Design a protein around this ligand. Structure first.
Ligand SMILES: [Cl-]
Ligand SMILES: [Cl-]
Ligand SMILES: [Cl-]
Ligand SMILES: [Cl-]
Ligand SMILES: [Cl-]
Ligand SMILES: [Cl-]
Lengths: 283, 283
């Protein structure tokens, strides 16, 4: 390892590379990048004090850096990391604080930067060849999938909902799995999604007015602890039962791990595989 | 749907086919078959009163049939199923009781019957072509994977452990993921595995004596509720750290969903994909 210059989102950083002494704080994106690149960081984000089962693969050599939006500077300092992957979600004051603990790179949470985020981690870990192949395969699989989806499915109304604390949410067009569903696969975002500025509640009646052809439903028990029957109560509702998607057996619950971030390389790869299976002409 | 004759494990059954009026009780195998075949049964097994997140994809039209080994005959009777998929784990008295509720087929829990179990569900649902393709692809992918694993990896010591209630368990040679690891991929089962007659505790000291080249570790938070830090406490143990697999970064935690049964078609398909990635010569 020598100190190498890293360009990331038009900013220059200097980091000892390749390295495993990576502490991830705030950037759940980078944890999903670690998952895809088989990187085992020294520090990772805790979720209610735990490492989720979906992250145990890459936290096997990790200690917690704090909860997502509460960096534990003492914990980070103790690791003496070569690089801290923080997030653009952190205010400047917080990023400055983290930097007293080591070289800090704020990783973007914007889905359109998915390739740049994975390439950053690849450059830190000597895994450029692997990352470039994953990106190349995704582009190829996406083109192939789009060829295999007929014009009717392409023109259909698809929607991603997530159930959290028993409520139903939709997401902006470029956020969550919508950046794959609409931005990559080229399905048309409904007006409700175009109007959303962040995670947005919808009602069952609005869902019924939308009446999508396809509904991807994400439900994590970990995010519904107090409402564990929320999905089954929805599924029993006569208005849900009347939905075209329900009638046509076009509702896909947990097609991707329900804790998935949605807009990262790992999430996109998994969602593409799922959407391929559900939307392609063989069906 | 007409009544069709179904041959399953050298027994003849008569069932209205194709059907969606399938109630699954006891056979978690059949729920993983439903997952792989995209079958949405009318009745499915509850797990501590819930449908696990890994099964929400195929329980979207299901009501519970009871816990795995406590069939709820009232619930099953209410469904008026065309067929009940029960399990060979049930005593004859219990299978007779279930049969008062509908035509009952005891699905085998033995991993070597994985193809027969998936073909049974395929025959009930008109999905023979899909099931035959999945089996054909698995055979082909398995042959390909075996070609791609070099003789050194083939001769290496691999082990599957599962952590439950904070304890470490291994499994017989033909049980869990061992039927893929050893029986299909052709790696050699260690003596401890050959000696196991069922899920068997091992100690960290015995693991260290084994010193496998590769360790697959399965850990579900749902099965460790009272010991959530059991894996991290293991991973911090100096004796764990001294393991060759740990030193060589050859420990794979939750390579497959940790609630996976291990010996079913779905589990085998997922484990094969994982083992391919970890054991093939590119590494
Ligand atoms: Cl921890
Ligand atoms: Cl594809
Ligand atoms: Cl449910
Ligand atoms: Cl339920
Ligand atoms: Cl393969
Ligand atoms: Cl952990």
């Amino acid at each position: 390892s020598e100190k190498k210059k890293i360009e990331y989102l038009d900013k220059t950083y200097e980091v000892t590379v390749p390295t495993d002494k990576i502490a991830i704080t705030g950037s759940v994106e980078s944890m999903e990048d670690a998952k895809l690149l088989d990187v085992h960081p020294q520090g990772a984000i805790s979720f209610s004090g735990k490492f989720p089962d979906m992250f145990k693969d890459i936290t096997d050599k990790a200690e917690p850096t704090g909860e997502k939006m509460e960096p534990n500077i003492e914990k980070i300092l103790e690791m003496k990391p070569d690089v801290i992957l923080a997030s653009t979600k952190f205010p400047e004051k917080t990023l400055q604080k983290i930097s007293t603990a080591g070289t800090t790179i704020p990783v973007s949470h914007i889905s359109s930067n998915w390739k740049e985020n994975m390439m950053l981690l690849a450059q830190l870990t000597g895994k450029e060849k692997k990352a470039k192949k994953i990106i190349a395969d995704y582009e190829q699989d996406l083109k192939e999938t789009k060829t295999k989806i007929n014009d009717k499915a392409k023109d259909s109304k698809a929607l991603v909902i997530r159930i959290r604390q028993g409520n139903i949410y939709i997401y902006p067009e470029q956020v969550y799995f919508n950046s794959t569903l609409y931005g990559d696969l080229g399905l048309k975002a409904p007006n409700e999604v175009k109007a959303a500025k962040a995670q947005e509640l919808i009602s069952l009646e609005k869902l019924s007015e939308m009446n999508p052809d396809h509904i991807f439903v994400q439900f994590s028990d970990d995010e519904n602890a107090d409402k564990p029957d929320a999905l089954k109560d929805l599924e029993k509702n006569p208005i849900w039962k009347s939905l075209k998607a329900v009638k046509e057996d076009h509702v896909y619950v947990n097609s991707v791990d329900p804790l998935a971030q949605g807009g990262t390389a790992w999430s996109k790869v998994r969602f593409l595989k799922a959407a391929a299976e559900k939307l392609t002409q063989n069906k």
